[PDB]
Assembly symmetry: C2
């Protein structure tokens, strides 16, 4: 469910299969490294820093489910645990870096709860800028001091 | 009917109101410099290098007409005349340059016949890569050696 985005031969970030969409953070430079995904029509929102295409039918079963449900505790991503408390996702400073935008954060059922956009270095911890969902709609939540990834 | 696209305070290219659509070359970085247009959701695809939205009600009457009709001769753009011969729009080399993507080309009735994407330097003249109309449908025509502008 995760695809590299590349520019000039380098991985710049990721797109992920979420719900029935191919989702990519808009700010990530380059092209998704699948020629068919790269050619789809994407609905682009500057407000949410998001581009989303309808998932190819052949890939529909590979998509992750997703949810607005975000009880406090810990969640999962490529690098390990993501804390969620007081409406903030945090990780240890240094785990994430430029090149990690587009990676999903998941609950233990495998449901996507957020897509990483960047991180604000707050000392020992880094607070993530994310696309995430409330019960009604998508949102973008960006801590002060965020560096886009 | 023509708007600047800007990124980091710099003009990066242009978007046009044509028919029912806001038309911007997809590859141009930045956001359209208009309060209404910036807040729309766009459909973006590499197929024609277009990023489009429905024109807001308030702006519909400002849209340009368009046509598929491209008899040979000369057409009009920001910098003067554009030659059209053998299926190719050409201008003198150096008249258009990086930053001129999204500018429209018009006939003498004021109908848009093409939107500039880039140019192929052919020596004294440059052949333009364009979106243009075949019957009712957009198409992308890109001379060999095109640089996206």
């Amino acid at each position: 469910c995760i695809f590299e985005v590349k520019h000039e031969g380098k991985v710049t970030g990721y797109a992920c299969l979420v719900g029935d969409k191919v989702m990519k953070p808009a700010h990530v430079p380059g092209v998704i490294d699948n020629i068919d995904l790269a050619r789809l029509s994407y609905k682009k929102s500057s407000k949410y820093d998001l581009e989303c295409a309808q998932i190819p039918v052949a890939m529909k079963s590979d998509a992750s489910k997703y949810t607005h449900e975000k009880p406090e505790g810990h969640y999962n991503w490529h690098y390990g645990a993501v804390q969620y408390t007081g409406g903030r996702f945090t990780v240890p400073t240094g785990v994430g870096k430029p090149g990690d935008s587009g990676r999903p954060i998941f609950d233990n059922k495998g449901r996507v709860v957020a897509i990483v956009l960047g991180g604000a270095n707050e000392g020992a911890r880094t607070a993530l800028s994310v696309v995430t969902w409330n019960k009604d709609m998508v949102t973008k939540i960006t801590p002060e001091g965020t560096e886009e990834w």
